[PDB]
Amino acid sequence: ESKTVVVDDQGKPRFTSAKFESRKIMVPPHRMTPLRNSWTKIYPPLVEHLKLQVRMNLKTKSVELRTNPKFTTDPGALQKGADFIKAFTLGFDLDDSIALLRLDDLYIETFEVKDVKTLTGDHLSRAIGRIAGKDGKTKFAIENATRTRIVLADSKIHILGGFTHIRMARESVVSLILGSPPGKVYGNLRTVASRLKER
């Protein structure tokens, strides 16, 4: 640009006109085994629709995601991919973690049986069998009702979905932990599913 002033009328001058960001996420080996098993379908939703550089240090058991400034100008995408890998590593399935990528209002809540009501040993065992139900039937009922997804660890219980959805699922599973019979659980279940289907 050359430099020269143009003096307009009333003496007025006249001119003429003239960063990566990364995140790291660990993975446990029991979760790394299906990660290695189904790694192939993990990156195609993100590297193509979010344009996020991926690396995975099996030396460090972690995954790295880098936003390039010219290739990507999208603020929440690295964060969304972080939520995606967090959900999967927490134990949720690939399609529901992708569902979390599709939406932005999908939220996770985890909690513990000792946080709600501490129980011991075989009491905890019978309680886990109760909250599971016969062959996860009750868990499926909860998931279908609240439209939520549940992950049942030893004590960590993870619930993915909408805010009030996981709220309702939390109230239900708190009832199960405290000792609710599954029939009255089913009664309240079709009640809450009735109002949620009516809305």
């Binding site: 529901d96 569902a99 039937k137 998931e143 279908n144």
Partner: protein
């Protein structure tokens, strides 16, 4: 209604896209199938109890033309409407 305790066939994205998009299609197809079956069975009984010849009833996308008109095809809707009823 009643819930199901089997694994959900669809994921969260699938049910949410379904919701993001007739009483039911199942009741519609059921009504359709039992209607065709009733047509065929009434046809069979007419065959067995008919003195006179009765052929088959019928045979059981894209722009499609309706041959039979239940109207003279050149009458306006406002013309066929009665003034009292408007």
């Amino acid at each position: 209604f009643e819930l199901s305790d089997v694994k959900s066939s669809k994921s969260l994205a699938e049910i949410y896209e379904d919701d993001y998009t007739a009483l039911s299609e199942e009741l519609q197809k059921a009504h359709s199938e039992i209607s065709e079956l009733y047509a065929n069975l009434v046809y069979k009984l007419d065959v067995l109890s008919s003195v006179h010849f009765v052929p088959k009833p019928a045979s059981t996308e894209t722009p499609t033309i309706s041959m039979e008109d239940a109207q003279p095809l050149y009458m306006s809707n406002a013309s066929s409407l009665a003034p009292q009823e408007i």
